[PDB]
Amino acid sequence: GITGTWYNQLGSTFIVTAGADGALTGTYESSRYVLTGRYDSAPATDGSGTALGWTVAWKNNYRNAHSATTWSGQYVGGAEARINTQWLLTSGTTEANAWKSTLVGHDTFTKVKP
Amino acid sequence: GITGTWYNQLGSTFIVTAGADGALTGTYESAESRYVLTGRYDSAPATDGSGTALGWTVAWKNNYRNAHSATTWSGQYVGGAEARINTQWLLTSGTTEANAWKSTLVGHDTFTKV
Amino acid sequence: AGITGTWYNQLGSTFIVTAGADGALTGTYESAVGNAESRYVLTGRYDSAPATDGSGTALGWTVAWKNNYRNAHSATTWSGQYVGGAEARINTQWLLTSGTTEANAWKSTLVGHDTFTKVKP
Amino acid sequence: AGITGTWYNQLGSTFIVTAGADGALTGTYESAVGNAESRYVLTGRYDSAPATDGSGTALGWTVAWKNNYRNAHSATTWSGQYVGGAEARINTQWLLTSGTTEANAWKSTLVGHDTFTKV
Ligand SMILES: COC(=O)c1cccc(-c2cc3c(=O)[nH]ccc3o2)c1
Numbered sequence: 001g002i003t004g005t006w007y008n009q010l011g012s013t014f015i016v017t018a019g020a021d022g023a024l025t026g027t028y029e030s031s032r033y034v035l036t037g038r039y040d041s042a043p044a045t046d047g048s049g050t051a052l053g054w055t056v057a058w059k060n061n062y063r064n065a066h067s068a069t070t071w072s073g074q075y076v077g078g079a080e081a082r083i084n085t086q087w088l089l090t091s092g093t094t095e096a097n098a099w100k101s102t103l104v105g106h107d108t109f110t111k112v113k114p
Numbered sequence: 115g116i117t118g119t120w121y122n123q124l125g126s127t128f129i130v131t132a133g134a135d136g137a138l139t140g141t142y143e144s145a146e147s148r149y150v151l152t153g154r155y156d157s158a159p160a161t162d163g164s165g166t167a168l169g170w171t172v173a174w175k176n177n178y179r180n181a182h183s184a185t186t187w188s189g190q191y192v193g194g195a196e197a198r199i200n201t202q203w204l205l206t207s208g209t210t211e212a213n214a215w216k217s218t219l220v221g222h223d224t225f226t227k228v
Numbered sequence: 229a230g231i232t233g234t235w236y237n238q239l240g241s242t243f244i245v246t247a248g249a250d251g252a253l254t255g256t257y258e259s260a261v262g263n264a265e266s267r268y269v270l271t272g273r274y275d276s277a278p279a280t281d282g283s284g285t286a287l288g289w290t291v292a293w294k295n296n297y298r299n300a301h302s303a304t305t306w307s308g309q310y311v312g313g314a315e316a317r318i319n320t321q322w323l324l325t326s327g328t329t330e331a332n333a334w335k336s337t338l339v340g341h342d343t344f345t346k347v348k349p
Numbered sequence: 350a351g352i353t354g355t356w357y358n359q360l361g362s363t364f365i366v367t368a369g370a371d372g373a374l375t376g377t378y379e380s381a382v383g384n385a386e387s388r389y390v391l392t393g394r395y396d397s398a399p400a401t402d403g404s405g406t407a408l409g410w411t412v413a414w415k416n417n418y419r420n421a422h423s424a425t426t427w428s429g430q431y432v433g434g435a436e437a438r439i440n441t442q443w444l445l446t447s448g449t450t451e452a453n454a455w456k457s458t459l460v461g462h463d464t465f466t467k468v
């Protein structure tokens with residue numbers, strides 16, 4: 001299922017546990033940073049994926065970028081499991097610079113290094 | 115300044131605690147309407163007028179209903195006399211592969227303390 | 229009343245647009261932010277026969293940030309809808325992509341939202 | 350410039366664009382089969398003097414989903430960059446906004462990504 005170690009298309013490492021209560025917990029390496037999120041613990045049974053999302057704030061004991069990324073996507077099971085996401089990366093800014101505070105992109109995760 | 119009750123422009127209620135370790139925990143009401151949220155924030159933001167970066171996720175399942183979807187909010191907290199949390203969001207639904215192209219909505223929410 | 233006219237966003241930009249009978253948007257955009265000076269060409273499209281159920285009118289346009297004065301090597305697209313009324317408004321969300329190397333492409337695109345009114349805020 | 354010609358996305362859509370000398374993009378966006386009911390006008394803009402340091406060429410375009418046969422009351426904008434070479438690509442992200450009432454405006458806009466090739 002969702003629990004496991006995943007890799008995006010650029011080589012980041014996403015180590016996640018999907019708990020019984022809908023919780024996502026784990027670490028993200030782009031050293032390691034804390035992540036938390038949520039997932040649908042009772043998905044549909046019609047072939048649809050499992051909706052999920054998580055957040056990393058880019059502060060650890062070694063660096064602070066004053067920013068945070070959220071990933072929103074779905075887990076698609078099968079022979080080659082995948083998590084397909086789109087993400088928003090917001091930096092702390094002054095009000096005058098807030099218009100350019102948020103980057104957007106898309107990450108796809110598999111259980112194999114790219 | 116983050117811990118407490120927040121209200122968006124469309125009548126939703128965001129009840130959050132900002133923990134010392136960078137955790138966001140709480141509930142989102144958009145009892146049957148209340149959902150768990152979890153996320154992260156920068157616990158050591160700059161002191162130069164910049165906002166505090168943060169994000170959180172709600173999966174739209176509770177003990178009463180399940181939309182098979184999840185929203186992530188990415189944004190910044192801005193303190194002061196009229197404090198705000200300014201966000202952009204992504205809402206992904208679980209879909210089949212054929213319908214995945216239309217799986218994700220995007221928008222923006224502004225939260226106030228009053 | 230209608231899309232054709234001069235509009236202003238919340239940050240002081242000026243959007244001068246003509247909505248043609250064939251669905252064409254043409255005009256000029258002047259930005260108060262970024263690596264920008266004076267007017268830039270815009271082109272886009274709008275729904276020339278919107279629904280009659282109270283819905284807004286879908287539209288979109290593009291500015292490439294090159295003119296006779298500067299070139300930021302970037303382009304913004306706005307996607308949104310015109311909402312008529314006593315306080316006419318165009319509500320948009322936008323994507324701003326810069327030309328980058330492949331190694332930097334992951335951070336090539338900014339996202340935001342602009343609301344336009346015919347009265348300058 | 351390398352942009353003028355026919356491009357194909359990952360899901361069976363096609364467009365034929367002309368990149369004009371002063372930055373104009375004009376053409377048609379259609380389906381793989383290309384029947385008239387699936388063809389729509391596209392207009393946009395591109396950077397006609399891109400950097401020479403290996404960076405891509407920024408561009409964008411819009412299609413409103415109305416033609417002489419149907420009208421979805423919606424419009425898509427694609428924002429991205431052209432990357433030249435033997436395996437040329439246009440890499441984009443897109444926003445698809447539908448006309449809605451104010452009560453439904455919160456769910457008016459889909460977001461996604463498209464990659465186009467010449468093959
Ligand atoms: C201001 O600081 C930043 O912008 C920053 C810092 C550290 C890591 C990241 C990072 C990693 C990553 C990823 O793997 N997928 C999508 C987005 C993303 O963003 C961003």
Ligand SMILES: COC(=O)c1cccc(-c2cc3c(=O)[nH]ccc3o2)c1
Nearest residue numbers: 126144174181183185203205207223
């Ligand atoms: C497809 O959407 C759903 O299935 C669904 C179900 C329940 C609630 C929501 C909801 C509430 C909310 C909000 O307050 N801000 C931003 C997004 C957002 O989405 C979405």
Ligand SMILES: COC(=O)c1cccc(-c2cc3c(=O)[nH]ccc3o2)c1
Nearest residue numbers: 241259261262263264293300302304
């Ligand atoms: C990376 O940014 C640039 O290269 C750049 C250059 C010139 C203008 C802009 C600009 C103006 C504007 C606006 O009014 N609304 C939404 C977006 C937006 O972007 C961006």
Ligand SMILES: COC(=O)c1cccc(-c2cc3c(=O)[nH]ccc3o2)c1
Nearest residue numbers: 358362387414421423425443445463
């Ligand atoms: C015949 O086609 C239609 O009736 C129609 C209606 C609404 C949207 C779209 C459409 C196509 C498309 C694409 O290729 N990339 C990103 C978005 C996108 O949207 C097509």
